[PDB]
Symmetry: D3
Subunit: 241 residues, 6 copies
Amino acid sequence: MDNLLRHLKISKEQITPVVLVVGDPGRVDKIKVVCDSYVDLAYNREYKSVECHYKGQKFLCVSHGVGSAGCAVCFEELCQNGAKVIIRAGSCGSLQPDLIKRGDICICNAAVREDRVSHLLIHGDFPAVGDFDVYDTLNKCAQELNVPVFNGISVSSDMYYPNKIIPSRLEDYSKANAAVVEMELATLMVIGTLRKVKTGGILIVDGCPFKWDELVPHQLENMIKIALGACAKLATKYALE
Amino acid sequence: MDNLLRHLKISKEQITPVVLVVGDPGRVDKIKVVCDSYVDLAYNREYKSVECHYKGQKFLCVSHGVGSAGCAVCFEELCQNGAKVIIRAGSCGSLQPDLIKRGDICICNAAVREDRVSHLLIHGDFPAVGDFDVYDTLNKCAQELNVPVFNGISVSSDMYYPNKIIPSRLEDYSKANAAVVEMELATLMVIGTLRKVKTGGILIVDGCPFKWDELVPHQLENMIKIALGACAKLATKYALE
Amino acid sequence: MDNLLRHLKISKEQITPVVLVVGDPGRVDKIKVVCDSYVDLAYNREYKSVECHYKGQKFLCVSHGVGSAGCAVCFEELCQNGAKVIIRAGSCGSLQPDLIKRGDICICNAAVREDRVSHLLIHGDFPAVGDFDVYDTLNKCAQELNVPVFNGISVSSDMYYPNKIIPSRLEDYSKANAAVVEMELATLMVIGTLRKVKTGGILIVDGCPFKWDELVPHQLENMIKIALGACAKLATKYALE
Amino acid sequence: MDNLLRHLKISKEQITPVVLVVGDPGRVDKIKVVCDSYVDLAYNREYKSVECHYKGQKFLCVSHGVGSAGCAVCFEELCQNGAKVIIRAGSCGSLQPDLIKRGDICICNAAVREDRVSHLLIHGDFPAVGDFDVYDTLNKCAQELNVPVFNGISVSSDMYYPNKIIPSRLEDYSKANAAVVEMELATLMVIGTLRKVKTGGILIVDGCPFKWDELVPHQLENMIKIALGACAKLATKYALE
Amino acid sequence: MDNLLRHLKISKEQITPVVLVVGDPGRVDKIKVVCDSYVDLAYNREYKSVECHYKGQKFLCVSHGVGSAGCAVCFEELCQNGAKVIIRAGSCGSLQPDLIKRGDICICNAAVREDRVSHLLIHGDFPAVGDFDVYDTLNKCAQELNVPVFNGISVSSDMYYPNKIIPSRLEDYSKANAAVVEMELATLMVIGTLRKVKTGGILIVDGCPFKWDELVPHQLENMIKIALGACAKLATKYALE
Amino acid sequence: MDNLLRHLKISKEQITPVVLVVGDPGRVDKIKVVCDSYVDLAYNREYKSVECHYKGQKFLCVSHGVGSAGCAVCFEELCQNGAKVIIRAGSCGSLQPDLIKRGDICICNAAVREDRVSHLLIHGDFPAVGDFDVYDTLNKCAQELNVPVFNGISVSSDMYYPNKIIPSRLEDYSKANAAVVEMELATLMVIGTLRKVKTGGILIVDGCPFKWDELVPHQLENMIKIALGACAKLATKYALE
Ligand SMILES: O=c1[nH]cnc2c1ncn2[C@@H]1O[C@H](CO)[C@@H](O)[C@H]1O
Ligand SMILES: O=c1[nH]cnc2c1ncn2[C@@H]1O[C@H](CO)[C@@H](O)[C@H]1O
Ligand SMILES: O=c1[nH]cnc2c1ncn2[C@@H]1O[C@H](CO)[C@@H](O)[C@H]1O
Ligand SMILES: O=c1[nH]cnc2c1ncn2[C@@H]1O[C@H](CO)[C@@H](O)[C@H]1O
Ligand SMILES: O=c1[nH]cnc2c1ncn2[C@@H]1O[C@H](CO)[C@@H](O)[C@H]1O
Ligand SMILES: O=c1[nH]cnc2c1ncn2[C@@H]1O[C@H](CO)[C@@H](O)[C@H]1O
């Protein structure tokens, strides 16, 4: 303890009760934009940090790059230091081609544990599940902002480029009703459950991994405001030490 | 198809939209009692079936005995035939000795997948997670009936009597924040997710597996009414074909 | 210790040296019938208990319902308390369609460990195997009562209703020469080996899981008498403390 | 087909109905000695082959060296070509230090599947179990020759020299009642079950893997004669095409 | 195909035969500095791309951020497009506290496969191994530049922050002689082997994961020049289509 | 300690710094022949031992029979007693039918860990990898003796005779670029890494496991001399205590 965070390279007194984590640090800037005010905090490797101010409340907006071990070090440094709520806003592909299309929004409550990091944390029998509150508040912002959302189960797969040798299960989990595929959410949920952190997550359909071989920015605008609004909503309760 | 259900030995036209499943068929009778009216339907092996009527609505109350493969055949026969919502009310032991004590009530949203049946259904990377709606409605009945509840993660272990040779993980999952231990809930949740059935579950603390070596019926009364009330609440939406 | 058995709800002084366990408690009654005399002992959940008297000997007849975790608690309470021999009589489906047909009888000596409960007890490298004596005595009663039997390997699968996603192995084990499929026998055998209890089991072909998509009570009568006779035979040795 | 056996380097018309397989080819010679007459057949790598003649019957005596993949190729070439019964006589160490001591004899009926070869054949849920007949005949020769035997479960471990890093399970399986430890028997049993070959096995206690850090040839004589006598006994039934 | 690379956001005609991949894009700039000339190519998320020119040769210098799934998408986009050789220069911690200290340099030839991405590519029985040539050339640059190096096995663990519940194996692999711990190298090696790409890697000791609870830039300078020199050396062979 | 080696039945003062291990003890004799002088040492079970003298140096030539557990006891007794370098010369089948044909020679540097013995030693995440030096010296003898060699990855499978039930992976590993299939090399490499022993291996193509259903002795002569020459080369460094 002194002025730590090893990877975020921010201080432990800059960690707020609520955090919004995204993957691409250029989108920390596109979110920076719609807020009321901000404080840029640090930019180390894939990890751009920032104090966002929206509707009377402050909360970080921090990016974890692509994939679970790298995202895990970010989530881990947050909870060790005092994030109470962590919502991920990001992108995903559709596992339901003709129901979930490009630009639709899912608010996901559980995910498939297809990394390895959580498995080095807890036995794979464990659920990766978000917290209901976070999931409920996120859901009603959608409804107050009059914006359709799906809800569902996401598969957090570490293989982005499947292979000719082993069965990629994604069809398996499609037939099993999972809605979307992304890379980081199971990890968030497992760490959170372990360290007592309420997590949640919302995602915009980029594409469908099944038809790779073959505007949204409006929806992108909606999704940020649902996520910003939820963080504001959720930061309220803790505001005052 | 004719007058099927192989194990429940009821008809496919007796399956309602909502079902309440418990473990012990003698408690199908203690629930039978607090309802407004009933129709006894069948009693085969561990599987006592019944049409419950409460607050203007009808729904089955069906028992699956002790453990997952046997409970699985019950849950499976229900969804194949048209249950849309299945809430389990039951008993559990505490994994948090000095916070969750005898008689407390958990409304659980996820569970550890420590059977085998779900694993023969889907890969263990999959979450066993209840549906939020079912979980929300169950939660607010508790609050309208002014009755404290915990919420949490349950471990559905198949070993009731642990052994001298292999590590029982229950301490593992305690340290991991899981609240209670029971035997059947992961299975319900996985089948449901697979067959498109909203599930949920609520449980009364019987004891603590950790201090085995060493009134509630009021709470039992509360828990039934929270579960009966939720089924009534949840059956409302489907009522009318 | 006082008047225990938690699930059987019988006393520890009512546990005999030999026990006959079946699945359906209504068949504890159909066996009750052919004996010379009986003492009904307790009926709790899926667990009907009974003192059977046949050919000069006494032995329990106790039912474990459908599936392994639930059956496991029954078997476990028996050995902890003093059953020395436990034979299961039950039903099974054929894995060999055109050799093992409806009504044939197998006396099985080993099984596939497709539960989870034994795996929480011992590593899956372990055999589930009956004891030879029990298996020999059971076999020669068949021959003294002039009644054909198959012998074989049973698969104790926890999935009764296979799925569209994962490979059910039953064809795998058919090609591997396994004779029949049931749900509880591996568990019995593993617990027994662990707690020093001789187990065995015999089974009547109900059907074939492979042609689901498409009198015996005489054989049922034979099988009970082979099992009753074996228990009598086997109880003899211990009779006198 | 012409004059095959790739590793035994004997002909397919030299394979008899019964075979006795041991590990060390120098003990094929010590068995060669007590027979009535013999025909030496081939000696390739670890695989010495021989036609034994005892009490009016002929049967091979063939050695598979140390360990399962190498033994597996031997067992496999036998069944593919027409061995109907295969008994292994060998050595083992005690897993029960103060009950099973140096020179005692076990007739084993099941084993732990701690190789890999069987697992590339069948799923590890499968039992490695001998055939009862083979096991019964072997047992009664012991009793006709007035020679004490234990019966039991053997662990067929591939690690002879355990390590400082991973848990060797041998204590695990001791606490679980397994009697002895050897290297090849599970494989025999699994292949046999797969290819429809009755197998069995008997073993003399060499030592105890647990006290490594700290006459029998009479018993060795007994064990051969129990095994020779069983092969004679068992070859009788097939004698005459 | 047109102007692809989805994550590197460079063109397929900008991919050279040799590539040097590091983790932190700020170190793509510190390497940019010691070269003779460069061409900055793209900067997308964690992925800064660059044409380096050193000793008469050109080769990319591309960064994959922290962890395997995210690094995997980088490595994958390279080989799909035509990298023939990929050397990773990075950082690691010591698994041998009192032999491998802060600032020492390992040239590693194999690694432990403690991700998940490779396992979705190939069965975990597969080695993660570098190519000998790459490893030899890297080694002799060290010796021509008169700079001590260790050689060894690296563990590519996805858990950076170990946990209170599951055994972190790092001690296990220490006792097993592994030299250093990092996060990305196994993946590189496995993808490469799969797509026919020679890989290698060299690493500077940052610290020791075992004493966390308790100048180098010279060595950092050496390591770049060993890696730059190797890439130059290795690019030579392909130079001329 | 006195005159140990339990299986090799040689003394601990007869173990040299370098050892050449082959599988078939009749090939210990065909190697015995091309040397300058020898000392026959012991012949126990599958384990023929011998002091070879070639180009001024001495080194053992010791045979481990067919398969990994049996080979493992040989390798293990060597390192425990003081072998510093162990090269295996043997045979293999081709996984690349139309590139690697009958009589070609591979010098292999890694292998697939498809035994069980190494897995009882270390976690399967571990690489089985030879040492570079051994691999380099072996490679340049080939080039000084003007004899083509492939280099590659070998699969050390324990199943020689694949089955009708489970997927043999060999096609899997072919598609993955593995060059040849044998039975013992992964074990050597893993033990060596564990006990600090440099290992290596070279192999002549006997056939192709894929076309089983359908002179070299010159190459055999070359391969021995490459292996003998390497052992001579490698023994040089240690020669003089
Ligand atoms: O089809 C997909 N598979 C996996 N991840 C995806 C997909 N679509 C979007 N993402 C998300 O976007 C990033 C990839 O650039 C990943 O971080 C993942 O979270
Ligand atoms: O401590 C416990 N471990 C496992 N299951 C329990 C426990 N307490 C209550 N149940 C629940 O009650 C039945 C057992 O009779 C089981 O069905 C289980 O669901
Ligand atoms: O085809 C079958 N699969 C699985 N179990 C079976 C089958 N047939 C009979 N049983 C046996 O009967 C009960 C099912 O009602 C189960 O307890 C099982 O033991
Ligand atoms: O303590 C033991 N562990 C493993 N195998 C043993 C033991 N004792 C005897 N054998 C048997 O003897 C050979 C070893 O030389 C092995 O083939 C094994 O079958
Ligand atoms: O002790 C360690 N454990 C795991 N990875 C490490 C360690 N030290 C250095 N790295 C390397 O540096 C980055 C972490 O910021 C990771 O990318 C890893 O590759
Ligand atoms: O196609 C093959 N599969 C497996 N092992 C082989 C093959 N060809 C050669 N060997 C090698 O030769 C011996 C078999 O007699 C085995 O020891 C193995 O190392």
